[PDB]
PDB file of C-alpha atoms and ligand atoms in Angstrom:
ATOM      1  CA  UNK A  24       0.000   0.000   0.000  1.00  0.00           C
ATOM      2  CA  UNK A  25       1.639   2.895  -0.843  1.00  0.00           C
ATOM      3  CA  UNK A  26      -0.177   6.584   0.552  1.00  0.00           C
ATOM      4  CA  UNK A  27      -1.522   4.566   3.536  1.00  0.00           C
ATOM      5  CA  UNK A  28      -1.974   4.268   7.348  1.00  0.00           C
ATOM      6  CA  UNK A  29      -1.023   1.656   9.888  1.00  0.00           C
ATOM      7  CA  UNK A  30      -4.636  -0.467  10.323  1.00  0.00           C
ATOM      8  CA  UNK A  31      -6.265  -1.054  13.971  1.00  0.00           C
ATOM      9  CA  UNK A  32      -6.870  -4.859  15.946  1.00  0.00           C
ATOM     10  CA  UNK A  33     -10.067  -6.061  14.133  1.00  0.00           C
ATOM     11  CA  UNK A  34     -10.706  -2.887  11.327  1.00  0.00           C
ATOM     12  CA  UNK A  35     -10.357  -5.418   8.612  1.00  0.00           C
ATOM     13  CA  UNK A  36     -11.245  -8.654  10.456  1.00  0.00           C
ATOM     14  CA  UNK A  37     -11.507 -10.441   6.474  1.00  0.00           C
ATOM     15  CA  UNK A  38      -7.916  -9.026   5.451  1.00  0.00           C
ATOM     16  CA  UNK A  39      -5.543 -12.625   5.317  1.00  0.00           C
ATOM     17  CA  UNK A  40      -1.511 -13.003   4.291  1.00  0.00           C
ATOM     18  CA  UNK A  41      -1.052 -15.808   2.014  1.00  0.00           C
ATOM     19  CA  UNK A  42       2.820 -17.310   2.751  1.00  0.00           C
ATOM     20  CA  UNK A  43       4.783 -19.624   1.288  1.00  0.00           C
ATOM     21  CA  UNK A  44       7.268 -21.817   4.112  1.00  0.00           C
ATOM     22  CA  UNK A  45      10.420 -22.569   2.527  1.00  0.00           C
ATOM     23  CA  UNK A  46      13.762 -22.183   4.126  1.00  0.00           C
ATOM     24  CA  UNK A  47      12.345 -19.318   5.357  1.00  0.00           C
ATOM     25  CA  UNK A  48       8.803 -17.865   5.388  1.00  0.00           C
ATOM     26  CA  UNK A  49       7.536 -15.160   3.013  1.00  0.00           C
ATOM     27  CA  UNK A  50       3.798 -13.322   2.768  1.00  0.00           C
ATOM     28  CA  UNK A  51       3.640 -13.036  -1.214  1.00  0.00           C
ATOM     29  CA  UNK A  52      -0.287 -12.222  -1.199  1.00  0.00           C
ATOM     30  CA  UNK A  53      -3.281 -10.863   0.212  1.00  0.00           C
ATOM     31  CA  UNK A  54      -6.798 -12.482   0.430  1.00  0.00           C
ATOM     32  CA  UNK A  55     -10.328 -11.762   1.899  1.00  0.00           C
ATOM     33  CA  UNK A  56     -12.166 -14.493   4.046  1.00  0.00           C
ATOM     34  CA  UNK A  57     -15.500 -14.923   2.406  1.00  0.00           C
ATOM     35  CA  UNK A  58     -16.644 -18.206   4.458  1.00  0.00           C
ATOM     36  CA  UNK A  59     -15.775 -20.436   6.973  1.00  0.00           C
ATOM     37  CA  UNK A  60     -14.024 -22.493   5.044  1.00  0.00           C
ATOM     38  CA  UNK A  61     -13.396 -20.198   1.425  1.00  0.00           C
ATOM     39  CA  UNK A  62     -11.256 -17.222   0.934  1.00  0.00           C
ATOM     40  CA  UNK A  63     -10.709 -14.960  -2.116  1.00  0.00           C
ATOM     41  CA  UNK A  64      -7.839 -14.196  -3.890  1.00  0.00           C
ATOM     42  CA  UNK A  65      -6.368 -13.253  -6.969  1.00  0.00           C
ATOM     43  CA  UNK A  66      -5.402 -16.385  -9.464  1.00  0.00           C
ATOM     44  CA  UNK A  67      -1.877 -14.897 -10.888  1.00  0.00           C
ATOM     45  CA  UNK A  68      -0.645 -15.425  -6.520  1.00  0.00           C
ATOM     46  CA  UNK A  69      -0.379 -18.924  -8.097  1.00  0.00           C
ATOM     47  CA  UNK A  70       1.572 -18.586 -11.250  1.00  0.00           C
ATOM     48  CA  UNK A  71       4.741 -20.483 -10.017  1.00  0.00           C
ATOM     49  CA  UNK A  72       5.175 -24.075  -9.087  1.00  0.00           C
ATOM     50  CA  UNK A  73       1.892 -26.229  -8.247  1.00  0.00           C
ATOM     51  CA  UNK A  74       2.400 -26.668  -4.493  1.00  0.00           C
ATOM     52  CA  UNK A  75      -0.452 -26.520  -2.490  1.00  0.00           C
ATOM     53  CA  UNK A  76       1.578 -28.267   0.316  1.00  0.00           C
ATOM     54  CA  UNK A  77       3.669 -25.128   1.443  1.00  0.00           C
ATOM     55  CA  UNK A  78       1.687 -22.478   1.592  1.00  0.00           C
ATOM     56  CA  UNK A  79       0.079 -21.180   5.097  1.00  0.00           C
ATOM     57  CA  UNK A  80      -3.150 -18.667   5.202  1.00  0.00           C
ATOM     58  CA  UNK A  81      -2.912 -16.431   8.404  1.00  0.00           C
ATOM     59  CA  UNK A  82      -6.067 -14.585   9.495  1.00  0.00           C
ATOM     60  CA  UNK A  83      -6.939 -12.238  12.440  1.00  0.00           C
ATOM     61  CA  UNK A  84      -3.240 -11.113  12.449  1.00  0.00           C
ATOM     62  CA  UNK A  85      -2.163  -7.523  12.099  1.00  0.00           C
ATOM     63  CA  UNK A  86       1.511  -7.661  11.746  1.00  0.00           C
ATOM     64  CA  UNK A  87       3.382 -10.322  10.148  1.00  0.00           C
ATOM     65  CA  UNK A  88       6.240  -9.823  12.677  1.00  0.00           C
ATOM     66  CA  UNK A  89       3.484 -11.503  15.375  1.00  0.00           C
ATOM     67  CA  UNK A  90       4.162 -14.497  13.053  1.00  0.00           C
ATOM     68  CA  UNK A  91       6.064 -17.695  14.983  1.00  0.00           C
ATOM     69  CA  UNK A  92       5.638 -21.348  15.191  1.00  0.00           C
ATOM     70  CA  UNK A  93       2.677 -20.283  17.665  1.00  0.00           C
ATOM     71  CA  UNK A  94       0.477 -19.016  15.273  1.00  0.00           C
ATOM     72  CA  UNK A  95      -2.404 -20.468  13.878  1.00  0.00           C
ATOM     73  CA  UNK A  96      -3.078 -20.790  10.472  1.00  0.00           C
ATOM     74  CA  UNK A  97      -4.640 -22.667   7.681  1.00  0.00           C
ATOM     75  CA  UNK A  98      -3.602 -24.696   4.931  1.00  0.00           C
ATOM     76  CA  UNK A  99      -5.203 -25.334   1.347  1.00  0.00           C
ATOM     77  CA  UNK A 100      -7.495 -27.944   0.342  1.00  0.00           C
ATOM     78  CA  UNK A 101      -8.338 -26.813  -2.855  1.00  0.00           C
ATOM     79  CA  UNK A 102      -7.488 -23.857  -4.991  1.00  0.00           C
ATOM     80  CA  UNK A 103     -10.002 -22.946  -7.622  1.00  0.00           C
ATOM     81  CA  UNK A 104      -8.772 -20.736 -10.604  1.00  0.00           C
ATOM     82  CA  UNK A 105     -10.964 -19.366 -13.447  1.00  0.00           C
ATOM     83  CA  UNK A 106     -11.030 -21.656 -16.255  1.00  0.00           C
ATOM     84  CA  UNK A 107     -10.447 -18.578 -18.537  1.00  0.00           C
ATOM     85  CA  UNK A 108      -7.421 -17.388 -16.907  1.00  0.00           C
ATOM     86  CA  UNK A 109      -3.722 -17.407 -18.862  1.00  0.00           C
ATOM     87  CA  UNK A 110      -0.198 -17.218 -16.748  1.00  0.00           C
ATOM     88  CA  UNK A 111       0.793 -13.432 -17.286  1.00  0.00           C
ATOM     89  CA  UNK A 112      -2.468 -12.276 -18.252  1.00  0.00           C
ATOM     90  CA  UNK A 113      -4.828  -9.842 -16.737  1.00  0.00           C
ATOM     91  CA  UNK A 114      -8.137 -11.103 -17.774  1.00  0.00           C
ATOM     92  CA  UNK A 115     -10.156 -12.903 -14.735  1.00  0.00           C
ATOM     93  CA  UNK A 116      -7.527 -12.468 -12.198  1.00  0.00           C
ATOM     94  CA  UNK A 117      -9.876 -14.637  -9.526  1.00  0.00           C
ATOM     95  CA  UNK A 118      -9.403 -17.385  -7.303  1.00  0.00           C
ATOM     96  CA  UNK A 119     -10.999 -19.482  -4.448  1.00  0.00           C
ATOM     97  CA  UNK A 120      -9.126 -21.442  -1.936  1.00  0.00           C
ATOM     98  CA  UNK A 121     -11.193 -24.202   0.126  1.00  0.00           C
ATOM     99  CA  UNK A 122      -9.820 -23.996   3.302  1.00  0.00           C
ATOM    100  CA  UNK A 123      -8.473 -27.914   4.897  1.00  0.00           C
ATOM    101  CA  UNK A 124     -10.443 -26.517   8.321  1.00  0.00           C
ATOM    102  CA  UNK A 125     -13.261 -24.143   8.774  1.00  0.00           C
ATOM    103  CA  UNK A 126     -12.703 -21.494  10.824  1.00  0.00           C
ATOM    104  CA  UNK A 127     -14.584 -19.904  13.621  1.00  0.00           C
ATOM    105  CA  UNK A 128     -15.537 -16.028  13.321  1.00  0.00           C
ATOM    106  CA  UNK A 129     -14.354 -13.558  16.043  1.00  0.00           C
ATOM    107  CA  UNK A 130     -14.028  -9.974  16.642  1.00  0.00           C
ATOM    108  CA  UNK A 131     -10.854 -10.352  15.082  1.00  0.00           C
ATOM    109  CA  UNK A 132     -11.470 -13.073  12.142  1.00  0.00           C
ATOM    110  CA  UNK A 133     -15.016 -12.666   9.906  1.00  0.00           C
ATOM    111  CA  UNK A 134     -16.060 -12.653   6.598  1.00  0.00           C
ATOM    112  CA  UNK A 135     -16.712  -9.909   4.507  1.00  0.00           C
ATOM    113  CA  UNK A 136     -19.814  -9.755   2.687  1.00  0.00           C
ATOM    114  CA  UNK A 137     -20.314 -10.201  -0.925  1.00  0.00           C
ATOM    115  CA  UNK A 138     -21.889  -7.572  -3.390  1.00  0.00           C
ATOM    116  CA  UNK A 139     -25.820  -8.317  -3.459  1.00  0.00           C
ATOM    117  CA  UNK A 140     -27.733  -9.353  -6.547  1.00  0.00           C
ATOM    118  CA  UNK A 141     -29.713  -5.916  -6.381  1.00  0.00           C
ATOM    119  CA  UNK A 142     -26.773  -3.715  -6.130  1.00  0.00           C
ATOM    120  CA  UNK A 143     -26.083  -3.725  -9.937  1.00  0.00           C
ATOM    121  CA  UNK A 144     -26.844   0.160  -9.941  1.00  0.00           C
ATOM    122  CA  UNK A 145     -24.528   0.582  -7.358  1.00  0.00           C
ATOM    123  CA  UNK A 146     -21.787   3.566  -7.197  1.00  0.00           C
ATOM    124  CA  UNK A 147     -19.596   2.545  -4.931  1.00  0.00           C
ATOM    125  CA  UNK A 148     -18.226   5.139  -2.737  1.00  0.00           C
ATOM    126  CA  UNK A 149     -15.641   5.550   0.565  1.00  0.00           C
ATOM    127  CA  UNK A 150     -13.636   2.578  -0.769  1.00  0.00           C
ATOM    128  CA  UNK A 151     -10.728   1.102   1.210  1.00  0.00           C
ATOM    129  CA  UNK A 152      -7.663  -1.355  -0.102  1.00  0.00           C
ATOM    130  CA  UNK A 153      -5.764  -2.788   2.317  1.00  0.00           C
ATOM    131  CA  UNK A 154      -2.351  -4.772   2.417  1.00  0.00           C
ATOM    132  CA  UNK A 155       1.234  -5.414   3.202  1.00  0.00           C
ATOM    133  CA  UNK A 156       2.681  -4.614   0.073  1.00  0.00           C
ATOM    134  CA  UNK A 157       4.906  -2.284  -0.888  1.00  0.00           C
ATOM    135  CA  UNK A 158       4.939   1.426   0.481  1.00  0.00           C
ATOM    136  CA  UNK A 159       7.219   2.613  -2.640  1.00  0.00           C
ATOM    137  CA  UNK A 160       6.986   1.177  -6.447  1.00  0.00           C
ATOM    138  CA  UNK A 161      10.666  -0.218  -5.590  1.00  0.00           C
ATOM    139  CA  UNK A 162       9.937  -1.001  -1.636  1.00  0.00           C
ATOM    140  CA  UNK A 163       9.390  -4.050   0.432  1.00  0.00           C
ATOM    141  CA  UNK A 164       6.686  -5.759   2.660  1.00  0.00           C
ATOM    142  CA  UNK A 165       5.115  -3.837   5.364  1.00  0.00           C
ATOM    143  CA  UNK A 166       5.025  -4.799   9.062  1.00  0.00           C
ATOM    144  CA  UNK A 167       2.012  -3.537  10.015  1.00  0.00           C
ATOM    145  CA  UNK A 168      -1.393  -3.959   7.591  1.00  0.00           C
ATOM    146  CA  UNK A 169      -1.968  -0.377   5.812  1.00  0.00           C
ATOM    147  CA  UNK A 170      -4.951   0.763   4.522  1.00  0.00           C
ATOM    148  CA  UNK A 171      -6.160   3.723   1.965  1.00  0.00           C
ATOM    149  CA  UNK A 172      -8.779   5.095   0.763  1.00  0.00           C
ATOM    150  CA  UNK A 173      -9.125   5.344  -3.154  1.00  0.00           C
ATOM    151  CA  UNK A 174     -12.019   6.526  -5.357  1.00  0.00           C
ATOM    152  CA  UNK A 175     -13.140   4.170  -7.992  1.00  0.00           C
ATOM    153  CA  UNK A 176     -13.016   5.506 -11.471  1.00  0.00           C
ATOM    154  CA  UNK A 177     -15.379   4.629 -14.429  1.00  0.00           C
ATOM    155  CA  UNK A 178     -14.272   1.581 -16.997  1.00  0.00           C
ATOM    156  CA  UNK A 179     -14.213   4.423 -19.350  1.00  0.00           C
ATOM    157  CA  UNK A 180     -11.690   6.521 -17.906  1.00  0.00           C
ATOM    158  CA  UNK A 181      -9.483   3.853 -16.283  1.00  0.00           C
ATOM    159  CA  UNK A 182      -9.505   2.120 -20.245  1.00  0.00           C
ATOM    160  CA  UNK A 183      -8.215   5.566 -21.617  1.00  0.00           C
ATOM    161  CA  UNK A 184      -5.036   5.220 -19.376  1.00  0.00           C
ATOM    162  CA  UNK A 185      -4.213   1.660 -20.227  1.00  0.00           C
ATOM    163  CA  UNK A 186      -4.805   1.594 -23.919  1.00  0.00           C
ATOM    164  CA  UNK A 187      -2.434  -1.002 -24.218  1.00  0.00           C
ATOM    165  CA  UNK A 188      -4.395  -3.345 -22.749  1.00  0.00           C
ATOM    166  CA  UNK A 189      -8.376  -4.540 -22.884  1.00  0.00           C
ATOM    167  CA  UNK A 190     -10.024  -2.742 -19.346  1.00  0.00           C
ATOM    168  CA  UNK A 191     -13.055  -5.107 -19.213  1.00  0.00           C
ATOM    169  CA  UNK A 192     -16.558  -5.114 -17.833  1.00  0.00           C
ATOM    170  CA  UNK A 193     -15.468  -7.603 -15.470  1.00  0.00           C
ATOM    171  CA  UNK A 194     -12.481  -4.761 -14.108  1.00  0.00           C
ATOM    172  CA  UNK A 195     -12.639  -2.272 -11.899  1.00  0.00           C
ATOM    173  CA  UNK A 196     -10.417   0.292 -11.405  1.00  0.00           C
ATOM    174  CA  UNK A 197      -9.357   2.585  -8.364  1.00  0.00           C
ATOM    175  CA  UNK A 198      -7.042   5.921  -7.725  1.00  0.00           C
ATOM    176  CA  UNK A 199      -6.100   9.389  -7.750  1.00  0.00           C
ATOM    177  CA  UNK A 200      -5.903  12.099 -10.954  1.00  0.00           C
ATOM    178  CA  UNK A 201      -2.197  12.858  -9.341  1.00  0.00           C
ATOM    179  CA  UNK A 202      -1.420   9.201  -8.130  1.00  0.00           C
ATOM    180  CA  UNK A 203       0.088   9.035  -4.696  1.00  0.00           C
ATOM    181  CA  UNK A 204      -2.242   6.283  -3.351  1.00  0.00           C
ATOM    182  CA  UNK A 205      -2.464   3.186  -4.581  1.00  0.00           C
ATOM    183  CA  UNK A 206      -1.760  -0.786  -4.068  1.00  0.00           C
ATOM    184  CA  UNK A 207       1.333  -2.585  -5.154  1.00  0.00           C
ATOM    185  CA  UNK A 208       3.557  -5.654  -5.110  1.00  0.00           C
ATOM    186  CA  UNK A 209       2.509  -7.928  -2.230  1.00  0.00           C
ATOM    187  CA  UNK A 210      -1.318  -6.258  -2.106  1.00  0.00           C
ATOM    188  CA  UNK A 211      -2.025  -8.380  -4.923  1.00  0.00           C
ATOM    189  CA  UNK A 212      -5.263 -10.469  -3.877  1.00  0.00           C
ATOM    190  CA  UNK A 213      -6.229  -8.674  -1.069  1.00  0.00           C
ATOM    191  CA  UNK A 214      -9.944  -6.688  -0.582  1.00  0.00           C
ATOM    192  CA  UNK A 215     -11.225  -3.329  -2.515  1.00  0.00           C
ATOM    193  CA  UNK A 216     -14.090  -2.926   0.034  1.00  0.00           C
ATOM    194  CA  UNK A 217     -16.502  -0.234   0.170  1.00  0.00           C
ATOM    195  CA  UNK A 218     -19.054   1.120   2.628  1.00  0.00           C
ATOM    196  CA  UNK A 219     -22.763   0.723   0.857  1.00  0.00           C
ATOM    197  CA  UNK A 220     -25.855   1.069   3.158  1.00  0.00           C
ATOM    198  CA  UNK A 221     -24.158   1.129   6.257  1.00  0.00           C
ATOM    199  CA  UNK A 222     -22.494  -2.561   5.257  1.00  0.00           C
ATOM    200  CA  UNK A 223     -18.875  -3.199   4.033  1.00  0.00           C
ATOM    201  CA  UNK A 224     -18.976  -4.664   0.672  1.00  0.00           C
ATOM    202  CA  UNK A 225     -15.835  -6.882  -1.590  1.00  0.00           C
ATOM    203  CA  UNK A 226     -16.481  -4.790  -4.583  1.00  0.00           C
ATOM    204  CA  UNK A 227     -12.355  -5.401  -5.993  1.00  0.00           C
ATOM    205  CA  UNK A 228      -9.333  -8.326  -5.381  1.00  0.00           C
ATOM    206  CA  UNK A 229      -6.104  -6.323  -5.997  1.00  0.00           C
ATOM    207  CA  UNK A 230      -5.020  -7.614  -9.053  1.00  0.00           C
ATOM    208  CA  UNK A 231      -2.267  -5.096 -11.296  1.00  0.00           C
ATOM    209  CA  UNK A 232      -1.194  -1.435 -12.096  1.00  0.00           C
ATOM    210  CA  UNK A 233       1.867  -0.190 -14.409  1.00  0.00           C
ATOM    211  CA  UNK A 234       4.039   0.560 -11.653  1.00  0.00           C
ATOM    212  CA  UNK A 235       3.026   2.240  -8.386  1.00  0.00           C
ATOM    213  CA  UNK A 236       0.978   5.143  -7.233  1.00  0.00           C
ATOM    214  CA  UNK A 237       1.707   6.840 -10.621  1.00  0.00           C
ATOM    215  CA  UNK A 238      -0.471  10.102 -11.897  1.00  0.00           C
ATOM    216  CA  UNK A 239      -3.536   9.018 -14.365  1.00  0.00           C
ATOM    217  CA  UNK A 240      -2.315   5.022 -13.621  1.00  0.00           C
ATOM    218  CA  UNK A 241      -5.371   3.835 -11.512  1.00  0.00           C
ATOM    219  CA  UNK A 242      -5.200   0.265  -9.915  1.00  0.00           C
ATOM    220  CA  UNK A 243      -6.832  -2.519 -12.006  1.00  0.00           C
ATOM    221  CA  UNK A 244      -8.971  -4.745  -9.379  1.00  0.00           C
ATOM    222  CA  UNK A 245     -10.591  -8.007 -10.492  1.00  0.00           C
ATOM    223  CA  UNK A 246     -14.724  -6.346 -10.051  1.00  0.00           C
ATOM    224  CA  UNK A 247     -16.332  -8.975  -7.480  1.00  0.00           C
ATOM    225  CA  UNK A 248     -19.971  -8.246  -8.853  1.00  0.00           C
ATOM    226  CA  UNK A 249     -19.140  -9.777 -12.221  1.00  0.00           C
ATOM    227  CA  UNK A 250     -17.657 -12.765 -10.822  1.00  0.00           C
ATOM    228  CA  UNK A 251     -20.759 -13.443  -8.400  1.00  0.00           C
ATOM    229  CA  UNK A 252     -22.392 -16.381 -10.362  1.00  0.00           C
ATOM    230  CA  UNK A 253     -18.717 -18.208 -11.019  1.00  0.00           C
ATOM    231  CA  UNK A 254     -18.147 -17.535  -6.889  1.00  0.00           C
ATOM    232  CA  UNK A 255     -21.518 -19.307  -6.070  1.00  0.00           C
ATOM    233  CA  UNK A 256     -21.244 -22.312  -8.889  1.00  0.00           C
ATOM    234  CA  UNK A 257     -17.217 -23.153  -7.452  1.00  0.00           C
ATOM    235  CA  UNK A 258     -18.672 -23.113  -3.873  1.00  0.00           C
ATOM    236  CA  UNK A 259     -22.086 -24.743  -4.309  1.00  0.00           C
ATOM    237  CA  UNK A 260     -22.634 -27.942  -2.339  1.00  0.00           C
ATOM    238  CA  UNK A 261     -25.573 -30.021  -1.695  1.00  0.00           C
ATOM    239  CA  UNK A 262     -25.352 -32.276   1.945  1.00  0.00           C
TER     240      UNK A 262
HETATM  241  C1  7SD B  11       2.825  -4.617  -9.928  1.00  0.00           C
HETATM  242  C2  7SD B  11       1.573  -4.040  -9.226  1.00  0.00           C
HETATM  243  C3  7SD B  11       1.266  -2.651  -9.381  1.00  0.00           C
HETATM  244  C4  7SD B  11       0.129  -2.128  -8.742  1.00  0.00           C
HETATM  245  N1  7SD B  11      -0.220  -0.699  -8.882  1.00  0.00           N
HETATM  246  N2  7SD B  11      -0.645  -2.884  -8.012  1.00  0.00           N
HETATM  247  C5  7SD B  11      -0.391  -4.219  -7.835  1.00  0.00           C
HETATM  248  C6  7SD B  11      -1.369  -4.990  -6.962  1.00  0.00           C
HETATM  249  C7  7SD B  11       0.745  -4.796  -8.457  1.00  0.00           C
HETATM  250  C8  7SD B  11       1.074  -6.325  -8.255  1.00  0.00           C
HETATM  251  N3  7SD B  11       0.545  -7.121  -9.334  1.00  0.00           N
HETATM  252  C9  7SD B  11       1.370  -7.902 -10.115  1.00  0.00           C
HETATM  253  O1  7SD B  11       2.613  -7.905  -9.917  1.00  0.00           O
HETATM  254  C10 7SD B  11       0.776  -8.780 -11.252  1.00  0.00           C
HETATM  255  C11 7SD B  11       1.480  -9.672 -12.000  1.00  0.00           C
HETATM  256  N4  7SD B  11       0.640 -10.250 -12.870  1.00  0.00           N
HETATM  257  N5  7SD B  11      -0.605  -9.745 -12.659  1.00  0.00           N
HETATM  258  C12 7SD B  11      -1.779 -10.124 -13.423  1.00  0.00           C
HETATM  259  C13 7SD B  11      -1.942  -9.053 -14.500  1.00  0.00           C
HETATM  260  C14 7SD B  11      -3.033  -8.111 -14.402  1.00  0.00           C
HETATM  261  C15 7SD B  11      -3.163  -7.155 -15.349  1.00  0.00           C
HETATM  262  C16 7SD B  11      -2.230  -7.095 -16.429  1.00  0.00           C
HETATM  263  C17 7SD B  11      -2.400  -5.992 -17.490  1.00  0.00           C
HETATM  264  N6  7SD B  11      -3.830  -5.946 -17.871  1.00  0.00           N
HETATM  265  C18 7SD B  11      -4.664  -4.947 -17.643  1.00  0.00           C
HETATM  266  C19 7SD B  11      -5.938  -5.318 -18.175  1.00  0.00           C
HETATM  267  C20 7SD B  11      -5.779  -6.560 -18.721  1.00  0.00           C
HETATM  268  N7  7SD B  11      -4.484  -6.941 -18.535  1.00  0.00           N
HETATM  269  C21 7SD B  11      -1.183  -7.994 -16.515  1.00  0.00           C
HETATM  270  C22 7SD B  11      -1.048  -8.995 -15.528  1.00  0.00           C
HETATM  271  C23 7SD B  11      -0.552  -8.864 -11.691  1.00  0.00           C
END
């Protein structure tokens, strides 16, 4: 997150670091818990080696330095990626992971809620990414969970900017005429939420920009909405 604040205990109770234990242990992405047992994230998190096996989902945790052996977390039992999505490519930039163990919601840990059938209309506003990504287009991982707050802007405007690339209906983009705020490397899967009738809403999964925080170079999130029927089809279960 670059522009950003240090987050509070329990503001973003959904946010979750995705790591990868190797020798050592890294957070490469960001997710939102959607379920007990499901969190959302973006698909290209997955573009190296198919392991499963080493990667570890933390939630209710504020600052990857409270990370030790101690900590709780979960591990994969399935990762679902869109069938339409290509290695290196932008379009449908969505996956689900079925958690191996459900998990129980506290003040700290819950779900955040998905956008609602009716809401097509909707114009989002007071919008909040959070992450920790970078703070600088050439920085490192942050300590402590940062959040901003970022306008969307229309598919019309954010296509403009990135005419080198197809801005779809299923995109949503995010950010300021004069940069300065903005997700980058490390956000990558992690929420766009914003505050509709009184109710926090997934409206983007951090997904891409060209570079950081740049003027007129909004953020490029994957737009939840338009994803809604795949999300309910991949989790659907009977008894
Ligand atoms: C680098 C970055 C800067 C930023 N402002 N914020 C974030 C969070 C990141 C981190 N993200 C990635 O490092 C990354 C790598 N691969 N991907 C998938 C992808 C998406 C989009 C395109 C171009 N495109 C636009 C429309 C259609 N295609 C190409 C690759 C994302």
């Amino acid at each position: 997150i670059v522009g950003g604040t240090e987050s509070s205990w329990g503001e973003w109770p959904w946010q979750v670091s995705l790591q990868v234990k190797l020798t050592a242990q890294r957070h490469l992405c960001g997710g939102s818990l959607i379920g007990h047992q499901w969190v959302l994230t973006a698909a290209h998190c997955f573009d190296g080696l198919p392991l499963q096996d080493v990667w570890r989902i933390y939630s209710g945790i504020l600052e990857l330095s409270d990370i030790t052996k101690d900590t709780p977390f979960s591990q994969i039992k399935e990762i679902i990626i869109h069938q339409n999505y290509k290695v290196s490519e932008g379009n449908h930039d969505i996956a689900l992971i079925k958690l191996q163990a459900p998990l129980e919601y506290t003040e700290f840990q819950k779900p955040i809620s998905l956008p609602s059938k009716g809401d097509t209309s909707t114009i989002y506003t007071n919008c909040w990414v959070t992450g920790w990504g970078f703070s600088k287009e050439k920085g490192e991982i942050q300590n402590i969970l940062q959040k901003v707050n970022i306008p969307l802007v229309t598919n019309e405007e954010c296509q403009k900017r990135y005419q080198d690339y197809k801005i779809t209906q299923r995109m949503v983009c995010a950010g300021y005429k004069e940069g300065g705020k903005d997700a980058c490397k490390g956000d990558s899967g992690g929420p766009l939420v914003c505050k509709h009738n009184g109710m926090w809403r997934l409206v983007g999964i951090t997904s891409w920009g060209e570079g950081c925080a740049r003027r007129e170079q909004p953020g490029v999130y994957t737009k939840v909405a338009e994803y809604m029927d795949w999300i309910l089809e991949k989790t659907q279960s009977s008894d």
